């Protein structure tokens, strides 16, 4: 998790490209062919220029930016399916699968009108687990990933 600096940033460099730099790099450090050497020739080329031309500094950054972004979108959607994951969030977070909750509310009702204690946190995770099976939803995937929390004592 890196950040950006402004109190040391140059003057003639705009913050817009500064943000572009901060993203194109972190998208590599986190991520742990021909798209590698050719840009090295581009950067080296600028080192030969006897005059710093911002109008050209962006035409090399933005292409590098758009290439990694195009490469990242390929993974964030196709390989790592986002649609399936968003479909999970809409169902459970946003009450998309409301039919699961009317049963969970039907069961785990008396154990919540009382003030919360140190034991109620587990008294509901089971009831929620009794619920998913009560709606014939049988999937060991994405079932243990959902853990209800009880903000107790603060």
């Amino acid at each position: 998790q890196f950040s950006l600096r402004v109190e040391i940033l140059p003057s003639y460099i705009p913050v817009r490209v500064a943000e572009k730099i901060l993203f194109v790099g972190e998208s590599v450090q986190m991520f742990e062919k021909n798209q590698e050497d050719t840009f090295a020739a581009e950067l080296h080329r600028l080192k030969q220029q006897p005059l710093f031309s911002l109008v050209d500094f962006e035409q090399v950054v933005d292409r590098i930016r758009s290439t990694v972004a195009e490469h990242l979108w390929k993974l964030m959607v196709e390989e790592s399916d986002l649609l399936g994951q968003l479909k999970i969030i809409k169902d459970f977070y946003l009450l998309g699968r409301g039919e699961l909750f009317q049963a969970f509310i039907d069961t785990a009702q008396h154990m919540l009108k009382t003030p919360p204690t140190a034991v109620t946190e587990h008294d509901v995770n089971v009831a929620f687990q009794q619920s998913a099976h009560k709606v014939l939803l049988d999937d060991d995937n994405l079932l243990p990933l959902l853990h209800l929390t009880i903000e107790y004592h603060g």
Binding site: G96, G98, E99, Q102, A103, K134, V135, L136
Partner: protein
């Protein structure tokens, strides 16, 4: 979950075609097998079916009848193997008193079957009843079952699809008595769908197979959202609370040959069509009590709001002066062709239904003054001494009419 109690020839058939429609919708094979294309289905099946170790699905249905012929024919159909032979019941060997007497006689086995079916469901919600109120079988047997059920299960809903006798056509000569008694029992025990052959066949025009296909269509469209979970209206009790006698109407009641006119069908035009008396399948500035419109297919809530606004401004409807509709949306089954771009079903409570009883009362009063066809009734124990039952039933119906 839910149970279905269908009585008499009318109810037996009603059930046959209702389950035909259901298995068509959910991709259930005639034998109870599941088709390959429907293996990964998302549709909820527990509501009307329970699966078996053999992977087949069994309806939560019970067959009752005073006579064997109808069910025997059913078991000769391609759908025969689907039903549960254990649940089906047939009398070993046309009057309401006789029907109720038999009901008193065969309490034990019927309630055995009902209990067995009930204990197999974790979250049973209510009951569904399909029967005719005129014939001897349906009327009396439904009366007895409703009484003993409301007594046995005081925490379950009881929904019925009661078929009313034709009146313009002069079928049961003793229909007034059976109808009046069944209505007594319905008011005194039934939680909540009136049906008449007259207007039903009128709309069909303008065999029992097609009539009851339409009726099963109505039932399935009523239960769609429950079958297909969504966001709102995820329970039968939600339905009932939003309305509470009823009448129904369905827009896309089109023959298999009448698909040629693929009319651009908005939501506005449908919801409008559901309002006209013509589409109300049943036959004093009488007004409404409640209206519900369930819409299938693509739907934009902006369109729904616009339609509601325009209809409200056009004041095509009338409401009670002493009290302050509803438009719910569902999703079509992914299997049956979507020949209709958007479709609509309407269930409403309207005061005009009172007239029905006024006719039957008029019919009944038109007989009780001359003691017509009471000889058979005196035979049974219930009417062996007197007929105070009849007087109480008539006064109850009169009270209901006054209340309306």
């Amino acid at each position: 979950e839910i149970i279905t109690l269908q009585l008499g020839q009318c109810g037996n058939q009603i059930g046959f075609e209702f389950w035909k429609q259901l298995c068509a919708e959910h991709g259930i094979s005639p034998e109870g097998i599941v088709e390959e294309f429907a293996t990964e289905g998302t549709d909820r099946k527990d509501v009307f079916f329970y699966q078996a170790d053999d992977e087949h699905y069994i309806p939560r249905a019970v067959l009752l009848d005073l006579e064997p012929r109808v069910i025997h024919s059913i078991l000769n159909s391609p759908y025969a193997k689907l039903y549960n032979p254990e649940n089906i019941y047939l009398s070993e060997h046309n009057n309401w008193a006789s029907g109720f007497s038999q009901g008193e006689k065969i309490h034990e086995d019927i309630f055995d079957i009902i209990d067995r079916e009930a204990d197999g469901s974790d979250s049973l919600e209510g009951f569904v009843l399909c029967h005719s109120i005129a014939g001897g079988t349906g009327s009396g047997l439904g009366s007895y079952l409703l009484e003993r059920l409301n007594d046995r299960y005081p925490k379950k809903l009881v929904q019925t699809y009661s078929v009313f006798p034709n009146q313009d056509e002069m079928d049961v000569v003793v229909q007034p008595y059976n109808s009046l008694l069944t209505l007594k029992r319905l008011t005194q025990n039934a939680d909540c769908v009136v049906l008449d052959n007259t207007a039903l066949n009128r709309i069909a025009t303008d065999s029992f197979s097609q009539i009851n296909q339409l009726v099963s269509t109505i039932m399935s469209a009523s239960t769609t959202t429950l079958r297909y979970p969504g966001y709102m209206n995820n329970d039968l009790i939600g339905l009932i609370a939003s309305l509470i006698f009823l009448m129904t109407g369905y827009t896309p009641l089109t023959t298999d040959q009448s698909v040629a006119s693929v009319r651009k069908t908005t939501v506005l035009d449908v919801m409008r069509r559901l309002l006209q008396p013509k589409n109300v399948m049943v036959s004093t500035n009488h007004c409404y009590i409640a209206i519900l419109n369930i819409i299938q297919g693509e739907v934009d809530p902006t369109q729904v709001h616009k339609s509601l606004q325009r209809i409200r401004e056009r004041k095509l409807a009338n409401f009670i002066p002493w009290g302050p509709i509803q438009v719910a949306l569902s999703r079509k089954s992914p299997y049956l062709p979507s020949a209709h771009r958007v479709s609509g079903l309407m269930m409403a409570n309207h005061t005009s239904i009172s007239s029905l009883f006024e006719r039957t009362c008029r019919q009944y009063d038109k007989l009780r003054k001359r003691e017509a066809f009471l000889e058979q009734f005196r035979k049974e124990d219930m009417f062996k001494d007197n007929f105070d039952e009849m007087d109480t039933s008539r006064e109850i119906v009169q009270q209901l009419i006054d209340e309306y």
